[PDB]
Amino acid sequence: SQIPRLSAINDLHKIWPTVEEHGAAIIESFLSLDIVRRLNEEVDPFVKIEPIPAAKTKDHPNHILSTTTRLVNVLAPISKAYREDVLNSKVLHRICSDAFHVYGDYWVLMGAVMELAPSNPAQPLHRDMRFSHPIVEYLKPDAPATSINFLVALSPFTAENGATHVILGSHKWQNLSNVSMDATVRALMNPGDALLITDSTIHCGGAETTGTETRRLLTITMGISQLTPLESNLAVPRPVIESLTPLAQRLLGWASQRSAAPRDIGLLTIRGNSIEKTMNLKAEQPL
Amino acid sequence: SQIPRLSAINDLHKIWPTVEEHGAAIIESFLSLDIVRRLNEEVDPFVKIEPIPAAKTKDHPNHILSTTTRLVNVLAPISKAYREDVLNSKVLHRICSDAFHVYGDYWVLMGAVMELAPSNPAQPLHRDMRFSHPIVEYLKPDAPATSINFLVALSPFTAENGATHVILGSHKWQNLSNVSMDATVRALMNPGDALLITDSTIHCGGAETTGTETRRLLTITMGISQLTPLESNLAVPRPVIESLTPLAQRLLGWASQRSAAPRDIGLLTIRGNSIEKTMNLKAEQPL
Ligand SMILES: COc1ccc(/C=C2/C(=O)Nc3ccccc3C(=O)N2C)cc1
Numbered sequence: 001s002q003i004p005r006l007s008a009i010n011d012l013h014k015i016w017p018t019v020e021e022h023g024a025a026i027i028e029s030f031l032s033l034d035i036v037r038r039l040n041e042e043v044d045p046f047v048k049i050e051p052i053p054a055a056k057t058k059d060h061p062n063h064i065l066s067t068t069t070r071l072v073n074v075l076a077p078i079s080k081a082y083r084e085d086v087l088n089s090k091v092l093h094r095i096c097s098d099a100f101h102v103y104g105d106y107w108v109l110m111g112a113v114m115e116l117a118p119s120n121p122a123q124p125l126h127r128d129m130r131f132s133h134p135i136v137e138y139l140k141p142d143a144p145a146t147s148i149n150f151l152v153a154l155s156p157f158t159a160e161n162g163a164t165h166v167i168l169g170s171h172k173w174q175n176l177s178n179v180s181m182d183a184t185v186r187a188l189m190n191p192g193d194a195l196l197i198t199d200s201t202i203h204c205g206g207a208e209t210t211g212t213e214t215r216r217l218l219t220i221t222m223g224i225s226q227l228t229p230l231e232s233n234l235a236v237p238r239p240v241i242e243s244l245t246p247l248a249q250r251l252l253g254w255a256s257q258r259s260a261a262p263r264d265i266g267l268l269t270i271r272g273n274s275i276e277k278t279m280n281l282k283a284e285q286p287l
Numbered sequence: 288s289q290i291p292r293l294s295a296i297n298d299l300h301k302i303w304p305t306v307e308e309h310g311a312a313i314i315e316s317f318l319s320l321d322i323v324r325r326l327n328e329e330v331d332p333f334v335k336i337e338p339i340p341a342a343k344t345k346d347h348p349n350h351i352l353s354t355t356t357r358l359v360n361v362l363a364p365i366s367k368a369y370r371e372d373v374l375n376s377k378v379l380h381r382i383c384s385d386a387f388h389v390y391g392d393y394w395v396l397m398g399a400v401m402e403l404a405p406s407n408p409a410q411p412l413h414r415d416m417r418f419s420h421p422i423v424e425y426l427k428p429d430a431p432a433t434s435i436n437f438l439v440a441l442s443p444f445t446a447e448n449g450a451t452h453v454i455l456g457s458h459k460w461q462n463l464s465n466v467s468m469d470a471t472v473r474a475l476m477n478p479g480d481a482l483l484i485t486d487s488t489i490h491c492g493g494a495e496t497t498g499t500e501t502r503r504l505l506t507i508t509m510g511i512s513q514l515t516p517l518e519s520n521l522a523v524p525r526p527v528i529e530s531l532t533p534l535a536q537r538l539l540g541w542a543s544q545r546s547a548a549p550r551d552i553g554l555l556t557i558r559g560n561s562i563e564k565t566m567n568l569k570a571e572q573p574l
Pocket residue numbers: 062064065066110112122123124126127128129130131219221552
């Protein structure tokens with residue numbers, strides 16, 4: 001049985017309940033082709049200048065990604081398309097509030113463009129967050145997902161060019177003795193489609209087998225405001241931050257956050273006041 | 288059997304193992320009387336101007352604390368004693384690395400001075416973090432503590448003036464049917480002494496019964512860098528931040544963080560580089 005495919009528009013209310021049951025769902029046209037084009041254009045140069053993931057110049061090397069793989073994060077100051085269109089996506093926010101209502105507010109743990117070179121091997125079958133958030137492994141088996149991953153196609157995803165593998169129902173697995181590529185199904189997607197998985201879904205990047213095709217994806221890990229993001233926006237110029245919506249500002253950690261606790265005392269507060277109130281942080285000021 | 292009392296100096300290695308077994312330990316002379324005096328002096332005015340915890344002017348009201356209670360957090364820009372002496376405490380850092388080695392880096396979830404007025408009632412018996420981090424309630428019963436609380440006496444703690452109550456062994460309790468003030472013992476302390484509890488230790492602020500005494504404490508919640516702090520240092524002037532040690536800077540979230548994962552990819556990074564490297568953040572520049 002294949003990965004369930006849903007309309008971003010007409011099947012909006014069905015998307016999270018589908019992921020909660022099956023551990024994966026394809027969101028058809030998650031981003032318009034216009035947004036994909038503008039996103040591809042803005043990140044293109046930064047992909048090319050990006051050193052190898054485990055560069056000796058880096059003080060936080062990624063020793064896991066293929067040496068041919070390029071990951072570009074902190075996209076806000078690079079991409080008008082990302083910081084305006086993607087951060088304000090009505091579909092992403094309905095899904096996130098559906099997923100995270102039991103915990104409270106959510107924000108971006110990481111928004112990264114990844115480019116995978118021709119002949120990039122398949123990743124080992126894995127769950128995300130194990131190289132950054134050891135805490136996640138100490139949660140009760142039945143604990144609701146504290147993070148989810150929108151794997152957005154920025155180029156075609158085919159079995160040939162290394163489309164994502166998922167094991168359906170694997171997000172509910174405690175015994176991992178049946179973990180095999182034999183058990184996987186593929187995420188076949190056009191640019192703008194998104195594969196949505198949880199932090200518990202067993203999955204892997206597919207093997208690039210054409211030897212010619214470059215695969216690119218926008219990976220948006222959304223998580224509860226109680227978990228620390230992989231990436232920082234602390235160094236993003238204040239002018240760029242003050243050009244965003246209040247919603248987009250909160251997702252980048254440039255606002256206080258709230259838990260779902262009946263009498264919440266809040267996160268990232270300043271003597272009972274919010275970041276945005278204290279600093280007199282403006283919003284929607286065109287640069 | 289009473290709360291175990293240990294020397295900050297000669298019993299350093301014994302402190303965390305004592306808390307892990309009993310759920311509480313008194314650290315005698317955790318801060319020198321000089322540091323307490325300088326801390327009391329610097330915060331004094333900010334305590335007096337602090338509105339009631341649930342002020343209608345506040346966008347993050349605390350509806351839990353007594354209306355007579357005053358809490359002052361984000362202490363770094365207020366107190367030279369706090370940002371230099373307390374944030375660099377050799378005893379606090381040995382205890383925190385002992386406690387949190389399984390998770391990775393740790394930082395300040397909140398450093399607050401609390402002043403409790405004459406005739407302040409005893410708090411209900413509780414565990415901390417339940418009004419800010421719902422996630423903590425979904426951790427496995429045996430999961431190591433993700434946060435700990437140094438309750439430092441800034442004035443004398445007596446049974447008369449509302450010294451802290453703790454139930455010893457209560458940090459290992461799953462069944463809460465025996466939770467009663469009958470089961471508690473008191474934290475009798477001179478200024479500079481600290482009661483160290485975990486996020487699981489059942490405890491409460493004592494009742495002020497003299498009708499004359501004002502009790503004050505410095506509460507330092509230390510937690511793994513994977514959990515979001517209650518308070519923000521985002522609005523702290525860069526000159527003040529650049530006057531701290533690199534260690535103190537990390538504790539305030541003005542640096543990238545690392546997990547204990549063998550091939551850690553890190554937290555609050557910028558395209559494989561740290562906050563401090565990217566921003567060229569200086570340290571120990573006297574204002
Ligand atoms: C070649 O095999 C791999 C490579 C990566 C992972 C998984 C991760 C991870 O857990 N988190 C993220 C989340 C978003 C984007 C990237 C990553 C990432 O870098 N790693 C290391 C697994 C297997």
